[PDB]
Design a protein around this ligand. Structure first.
Ligand SMILES: C/C(O)=C1\C=C(c2ccccn2)c2cccc[n+]21
Ligand SMILES: C/C(O)=C1\C=C(c2ccccn2)c2cccc[n+]21
Lengths: 110, 116
């Protein structure tokens, strides 16, 4: 537990987890269920909010920039895998914009 | 009267942007994408909001941003355009990821309270 990590749990994750666009990112991408047979050929580090939330709850992270990187990876995976015109890209952009807004007011010192 | 000068914006300019700019992978990002000179006739059909570190640097220098998050959004847009336009296997994608990680590392150390 640091001040920065607690801000990411209570302020950042809280904001994002309950968002109306959050639902495709709450659990790991299931390639079989989603019909995406190349997903893991293209994405080598899958990431999702459920994993991140769990990690925060279980005190997995030693620094806030670590947790921050998990959020970025999740969003980046989405942009790299999907087609430019897909709704999901649009949903990821919206969520990423809230992420950065909250992260701007995050405590400076670990 | 677009924006002002804050502590966070001074930090994004002198500490975050400076590091990224001088990075060995930064060269494709220092100026707007010239789709003609590069032979990418579909760029502007796919990327609706072009952004580059040259534009962000100028905006910082002319007090265009009102708050830090506005400048952060511009950084995010630059990185996202790259991921969205380019093929997953392209070198450019790897370069952007590297820069994006540094950006996040340095944003984590930005002053918490925005003061004019
Ligand atoms: C994160 C991501 O790329 C997802 C996430 C979904 C998704 C779609 C429905 C239910 C849960 N997740 C999806 C569908 C098609 C293509 C890509 N994705
Ligand atoms: C930011 C971006 O997407 C760039 C930027 C370049 C680039 C290529 C050569 C010189 C300057 N910039 C490029 C080339 C091919 C595909 C994509 N890009």
């Amino acid at each position: 537990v640091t001040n920065q990590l607690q801000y990411l749990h209570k302020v950042v994750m809280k904001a994002l987890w309950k968002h109306q666009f959050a639902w495709p990112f709450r659990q790991p991408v299931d390639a079989v269920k989603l019909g995406l047979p190349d997903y893991h050929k293209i994405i080598k580090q899958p990431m999702d909010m459920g994993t991140i939330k769990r990690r925060l709850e279980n005190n997995y992270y030693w620094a806030a920039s670590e947790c921050m990187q998990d959020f970025n990876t999740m969003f980046t995976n989405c942009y790299i895998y999907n087609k430019p015109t897909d709704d999901i890209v649009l949903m990821a952009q919206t969520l990423e914009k809230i992420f950065l807004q909250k992260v701007a007011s995050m405590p400076q010192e670990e």
